[PDB]
Symmetry: C3
Subunit: 439 residues, 3 copies
Amino acid sequence: PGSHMAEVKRKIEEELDRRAQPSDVGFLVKSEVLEALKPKIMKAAFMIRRAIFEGRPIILRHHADTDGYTAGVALETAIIPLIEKVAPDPEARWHLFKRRPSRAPFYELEDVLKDIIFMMEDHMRFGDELPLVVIVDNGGTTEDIPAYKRLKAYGVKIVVIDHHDPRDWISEDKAKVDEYVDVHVNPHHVKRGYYELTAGMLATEVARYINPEVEDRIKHLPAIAGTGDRSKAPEFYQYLEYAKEKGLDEEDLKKIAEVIDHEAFYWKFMDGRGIIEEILLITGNLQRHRMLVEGIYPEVKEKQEKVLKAVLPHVKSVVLPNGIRFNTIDVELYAPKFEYPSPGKLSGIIHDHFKEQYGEDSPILTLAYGPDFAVVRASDGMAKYNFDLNKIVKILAEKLPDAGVEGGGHSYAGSIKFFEGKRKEVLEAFAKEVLKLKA
Amino acid sequence: PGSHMAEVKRKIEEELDRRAQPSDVGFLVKSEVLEALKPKIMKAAFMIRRAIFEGRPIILRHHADTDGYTAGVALETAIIPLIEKVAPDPEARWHLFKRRPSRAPFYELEDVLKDIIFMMEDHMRFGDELPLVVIVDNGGTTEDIPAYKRLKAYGVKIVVIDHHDPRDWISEDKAKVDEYVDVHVNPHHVKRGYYELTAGMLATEVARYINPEVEDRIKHLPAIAGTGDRSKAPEFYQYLEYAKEKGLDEEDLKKIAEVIDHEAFYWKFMDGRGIIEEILLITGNLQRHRMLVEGIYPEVKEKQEKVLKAVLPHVKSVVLPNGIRFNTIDVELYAPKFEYPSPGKLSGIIHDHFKEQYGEDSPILTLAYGPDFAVVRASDGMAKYNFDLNKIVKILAEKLPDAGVEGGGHSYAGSIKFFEGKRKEVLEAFAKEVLKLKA
Amino acid sequence: PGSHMAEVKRKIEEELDRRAQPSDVGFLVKSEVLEALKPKIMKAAFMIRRAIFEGRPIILRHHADTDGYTAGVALETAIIPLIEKVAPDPEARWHLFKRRPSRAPFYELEDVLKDIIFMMEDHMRFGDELPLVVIVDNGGTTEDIPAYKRLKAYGVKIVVIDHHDPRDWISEDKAKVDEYVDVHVNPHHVKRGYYELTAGMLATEVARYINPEVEDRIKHLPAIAGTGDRSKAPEFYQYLEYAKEKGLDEEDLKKIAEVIDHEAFYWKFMDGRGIIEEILLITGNLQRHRMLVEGIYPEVKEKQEKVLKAVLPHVKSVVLPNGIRFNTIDVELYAPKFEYPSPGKLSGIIHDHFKEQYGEDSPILTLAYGPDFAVVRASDGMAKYNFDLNKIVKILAEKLPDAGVEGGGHSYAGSIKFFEGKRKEVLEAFAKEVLKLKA
Ligand SMILES: [Mn+2]
Ligand SMILES: [Mn+2]
Ligand SMILES: [Mn+2]
């Protein structure tokens, strides 16, 4: 009776463990970082494959930019075929895998609460198991913990593939966030500061372990992802060779990245299925890829040139006594609100213009502000002055405890929030900290 | 032919009337107000049970706060089992009952128009009857009439369970809104001003008449609802005993209420199914309830403390000649826009702080304003000065006919709207009315 | 084998061509413009009928105002019955036709990207062919081309039924946009400037060619559409007679139009199915139509009167030396934000008031502005001064290249956008251009 069913179940669990084990397929490039991450990469692939083979649903959340979309689509491309080979139902693909972008740089409560409500409905209504959750290009920080506390109330297992700094280290290779997730694939564990190995690179390698058969289809994705995130990693320069083999040079890759970020701005919370795959060149439909990229890119380029031409006259640029070129722009007063490009993207376009004119290695700091936020971008040259945005933000919060100062990101790129009524004081204090920097 | 079908239909209608009659199960507490409301309570339960037994769908709309969610979930908990016992289809639960929160304190046109479009699709596409509409913690005022005029164009029957003042009385126990709905359960009909018998209390009692079998599961809900709405009713202090029996003390209840209001802020238009039931302790899954409340509450507490610490230095507090402590805070300039806590919730947190420091019975008036709105909170002590927000709003509208003044709510708690360009004049006139109050 | 299937397919294509041919049913009114548009009208109907007969889905996009809704519903009313007669499945109606409003006056990227994602899902998941796309009261301009470039990457066929000026003419009867669509029905091709033959007029005639059987049901729709768009066309005054036959006088039509624009404001991205048909009087349910229009219209009228009374004292009206009456109103400072009526609608209500008081033929220019936009309305009297908004906008952009000036619309009605920080300069320059106009 129950003994028959239990003994058969126990054997099924064991055979699932065995079949889920990924092969050691190595990597597409040479990298000591990837080699050091191999055990966690193989564990991630094991967990994903096991969910697939047991008919458990998967939710894949990814950040909504080129690197994130590329990473998410890499994983989807490996997963879907496996789901289709083991499922009798042709609806299984659509039902047992969901990809959802996150516009925020962390797993927002609105996102996780939606994921929980949706998964609980499928559970109660159709008897589905609760899903494996895979978070990509997000998830590896302390800001993600609130979401994970909620998922753990449901016994949900969680895979993270990210390349942002977890920051709060509890040991040499363990961060605070790691206690709330089951496997965390992140270069920062094996080499602190190695942001340049991006989510799309990591995710493509994980995807190869999940399903070695999709290698040839996706091996160029890391070049697209690295272009999106502007990686200067030795791994990236190897990954580029796979794109070249398919006829994509470096300018092609840049156009593709710009197209993805533009289209994703407009489709918002939708996932771009039916479009993103064509842009990323993972279907055999070369003509549709060309029509999309050649149709869209000129439009994107023209918008950027138009907005730059109109906004640039309002950018104040001063060379400070220490040699720093400090640029400021009020993107509430002198930018089109709610339109492409967003303040973040606009600040990048302005910053790039100053880099093209004066050089990336010149010390350039671009501050783009609204009523209650500022986006900050620092050229590589700012490293010569030990510019660290996180340190400056902590300083500002301590000097102005009533101004609601918050944020940061990278030491060289990120954003600040503050109370609108204390903007003048916060930004003047920010400027004083920049003046005081020493070579 | 048609005579066979018609005679059988007529007998089915009569047996439906008979079976729908609820038993007189009394109440969970002693209350002359509930006793006086019994006929309408029994009518509400009759209408709901009848819809269920005829296979008619039900839409339940409720305000999106602790009292409203609690009330809605109380009713759902009684209804779903009955639907499942009479329906052959296991999809009947999901199809023939819908719970939809309303963030507005009235049945907004966007909500009712969506309800009508959705119900008309089910009608035309699947042949469903048009639903019984049950509105809870909303619906009992003149601001709800526009929605009801639209529903009545479709011959829809409407149950209202609310505890806000209908205001526009046409007789001793009948208000203007009552002409547009089929049964209105509201303590104000039998005892004017008795707001402290809240929707979750009322709805739990209605739920017991709908389905006496769920009594033990939901009899603690009124304690949660009353905590959310800060009821000081004699009924509330009895209802608390049912929560104590299940191990929930008064601090537990407060944490639960704070958790609901926090989570509901983030899930927005979603209904929280799969989560809210766990927080409200109506499943047997004690561990999940604990993980959610103990996981979430510290996070909620920390956000409130952080925001309070940052905002408090910007609150102006003056004791006026008449003894009133008048607090003002610009929540556009000195609060985080679009984040938890909302302006309404923030004003409450600031107001509570002033109450803790100076006492609830001291006369405290907290005015939190943005560009074009203000939230007003008056301590019990303000009653000694005959403070009435609705009267003050009428005065302001008459003195400043070009300023677009509108709103009110309770005599002691509510909000004003006005034209941004007349803010100074409106708020200075508001302050003069407060100065002129006499003990 | 493949020869059997291919020969049968070829014959099916030929019989589809034959059956899709519409009858020459003439028109409901006398019109040289319609006569000149007949070949394109018949082509539009051919393409729509062919899609229906082959079981291809149709997406109908329309602008979200009275004229657009009326046009969309006219076409839906003709299409649905044909779909139902040729489809075995009773779900075919719901699956093979979709009507989606567009709030923007062009085919926005957010709309088209959603259409592409949705159509690609149906394609991949259910094997549906890609749809015929029909755009109505939008689509006939250069601002629509980006959407069409994306649709053409998927080989999608596109029908446009619009009455806005394509502007960018490449020959006498061909505009730039025409290269991206398969048939464009627009009076401007055969008579430049003939905006007064509106989308609902055009669409009703197309609908008659699609399905002559629905003529009697929809022949009054053009009167509603023309009322919404305030057409003074000779065709309109004929179309009115069909409304009179059904008991709708000119005041009834105005109430209907005001009701549609009000309700559509609140249901937003939803399509109003189950409601709009009743308001438009195309069902046999006269009582529901009456309850909706008589229930809703007084509420609409009261809102307009209330807002007008409160806002009018803030309108500055000056008669300029040249005789022009120039009205200005700051609708950010002195109007209710986010509520009915929108800035566009509010400007119309203010403008109408000035027209009622001083006459339509008096030269009246109403400028309603926010932080970063302005809505402009010119009475017929402004024609005596050669007022052209598009020319003025070009002038402003050239004089103020750093102010981000954009927009236009009609020579007499439209809107400008600009950078908030250059508002003063843009509006003062706008006012100088108006001062300089000569009779
Ligand atoms: Mn990345
Ligand atoms: Mn309540
Ligand atoms: Mn139109």
